[PDB]
Design an enzyme around this catalytic site. Structure first.
Site, PDB file in Angstrom:
ATOM      1  N   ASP A 182      41.051  62.524  18.562  1.00  0.00           N
ATOM      2  CA  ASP A 182      41.567  63.861  18.287  1.00  0.00           C
ATOM      3  C   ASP A 182      40.906  64.437  17.036  1.00  0.00           C
ATOM      4  OD1 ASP A 182      43.283  66.111  17.685  1.00  0.00           O
ATOM      5  OD2 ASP A 182      44.463  64.701  16.455  1.00  0.00           O
ATOM      6  N   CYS A 217      34.215  65.331  31.410  1.00  0.00           N
ATOM      7  CA  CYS A 217      35.656  65.209  31.190  1.00  0.00           C
ATOM      8  C   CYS A 217      36.287  66.374  31.964  1.00  0.00           C
ATOM      9  CB  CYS A 217      36.084  65.253  29.728  1.00  0.00           C
ATOM     10  SG  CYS A 217      37.951  65.118  29.488  1.00  0.00           S
ATOM     11  N   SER A 218      36.780  67.384  31.254  1.00  0.00           N
ATOM     12  CA  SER A 218      37.546  68.399  31.959  1.00  0.00           C
ATOM     13  C   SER A 218      36.683  69.595  32.357  1.00  0.00           C
ATOM     14  CB  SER A 218      38.725  68.879  31.082  1.00  0.00           C
ATOM     15  OG  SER A 218      38.257  69.329  29.808  1.00  0.00           O
ATOM     16  N   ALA A 219      36.110  70.336  31.398  1.00  0.00           N
ATOM     17  CA  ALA A 219      35.246  71.464  31.748  1.00  0.00           C
ATOM     18  C   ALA A 219      33.786  71.071  32.014  1.00  0.00           C
ATOM     19  CB  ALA A 219      35.256  72.534  30.634  1.00  0.00           C
ATOM     20  N   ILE A 221      31.574  70.501  29.571  1.00  0.00           N
ATOM     21  CA  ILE A 221      30.700  70.999  28.538  1.00  0.00           C
ATOM     22  C   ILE A 221      30.903  70.408  27.160  1.00  0.00           C
ATOM     23  CG2 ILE A 221      30.202  73.144  29.754  1.00  0.00           C
ATOM     24  CD1 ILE A 221      32.221  74.525  27.812  1.00  0.00           C
ATOM     25  N   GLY A 222      32.118  70.092  26.778  1.00  0.00           N
ATOM     26  CA  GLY A 222      32.344  69.776  25.365  1.00  0.00           C
ATOM     27  C   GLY A 222      32.030  68.344  25.003  1.00  0.00           C
ATOM     28  N   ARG A 223      32.910  67.462  25.432  1.00  0.00           N
ATOM     29  CA  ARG A 223      32.680  66.032  25.266  1.00  0.00           C
ATOM     30  C   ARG A 223      31.433  65.623  26.003  1.00  0.00           C
ATOM     31  NH1 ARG A 223      38.858  63.715  26.311  1.00  0.00           N
ATOM     32  NH2 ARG A 223      39.856  65.255  24.944  1.00  0.00           N
ATOM     33  N   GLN A 261      31.101  72.305  22.840  1.00  0.00           N
ATOM     34  CA  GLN A 261      31.848  73.551  22.849  1.00  0.00           C
ATOM     35  C   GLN A 261      32.415  73.891  21.477  1.00  0.00           C
ATOM     36  OE1 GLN A 261      35.055  73.531  25.585  1.00  0.00           O
ATOM     37  NE2 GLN A 261      35.077  75.755  25.714  1.00  0.00           N
TER      38      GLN A 261
END
Length: 282
Positions: A182, A217-219, A221-223, A261
């Site tokens: 986090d 992961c989810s989108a 793009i970020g991780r 992101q």
């Protein structure tokens, strides 16, 4: 497109200068896709996030089961260049949603993908990712997915998987990383670096011209951008003795809008690369 070549000393200090990092990071265009590009009824049902869409030049198109149907052939995924611009080293994609689990596996089969990297924490299942793999076995649009083994390690769980469609059998490694922090502080960098190294080494074990490695992961793009940027820059550090995270992020953005992101993500890559450079120097 933009470039900041970092030698070791500047790299360690850059990772600890959040004011410069955000100044640099928020100059990088996101390169997001105009939603008008995919004005196809029902398409929004295939996307988790209405404004995180695959850039059209690098989009993965599914050819099964009806290649003539623009909705059947759509998946929210992009080919991603690797180190030195090598084509299609990765596919960045969103965590499958219930309506796209079969699409995801169609992608895995179509692309001969040997490795999946899933950067989703336990807490975030069935909200940031549909559990798309079986306990043991399951079948989707013609491909049977069999989890043969689960190896638990501190930082990730590795599933050895077999995929059978008709007469053909293929192996797949599913790396499920569970230590995404986090707070993106330097104490949380080692597990990410470990995962990057293990995956890049599994990738080398596939031999010449390894098929695309799927990362999500989810989108998507970020991780996902963090993992890919770290993988690219680890090769850059080994080969060139420098890292250019800014140029690598721009290369990623050109392949898929929004890769890396957040500025916290961007700083995390720097913490990881700083750690790696220290390791390499001994």
């Amino acid at each position: 497109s933009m470039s900041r070549v970092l030698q070791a000393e500047e790299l360690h200090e850059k990772a600890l200068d959040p004011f410069l990092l955000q100044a640099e990071f928020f100059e990088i265009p996101m390169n997001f896709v105009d939603p008008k590009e995919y004005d196809i009824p029902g398409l929004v049902r295939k996307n988790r996030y209405k404004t995180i869409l695959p850039n059209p030049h690098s989009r993965v198109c599914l050819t099964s089961p009806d290649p003539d149907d623009p909705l059947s052939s759509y998946i929210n995924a992009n080919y991603i260049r690797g180190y030195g611009g090598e084509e299609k080293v990765y596919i960045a994609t969103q965590g499958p949603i219930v309506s796209t689990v079969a699409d995801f596996w169609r992608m895995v089969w179509q692309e001969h993908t040997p490795i999946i990297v899933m950067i989703t924490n336990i807490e975030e299942m069935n909200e940031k990712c549909t559990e798309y793999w079986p306990e043991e076995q399951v079948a989707y649009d013609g491909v049977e997915i069999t989890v043969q083994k689960v190896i638990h390690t501190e930082d990730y769980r590795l599933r050895l998987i077999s995929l059978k469609s008709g007469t053909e059998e293929r192996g797949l490694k599913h790396y499920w990383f569970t230590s995404w922090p986090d707070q993106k502080t330097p104490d949380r960098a080692p597990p990410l670096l470990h995962l990057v190294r293990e995956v890049e080494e599994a990738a080398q074990q596939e031999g010449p011209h390894c098929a695309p490695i799927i990362v999500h992961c989810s989108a998507g793009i970020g991780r996902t951008g963090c993992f890919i940027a770290t993988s690219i820059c680890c090769q850059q550090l080994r080969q060139e003795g420098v890292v250019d995270i800014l140029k690598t992020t721009c290369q990623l953005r050109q392949d898929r809008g929004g890769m890396i992101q957040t500025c916290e993500q961007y700083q995390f890559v720097h913490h990881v690369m700083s750690l790696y450079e220290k390791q390499l120097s001994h």
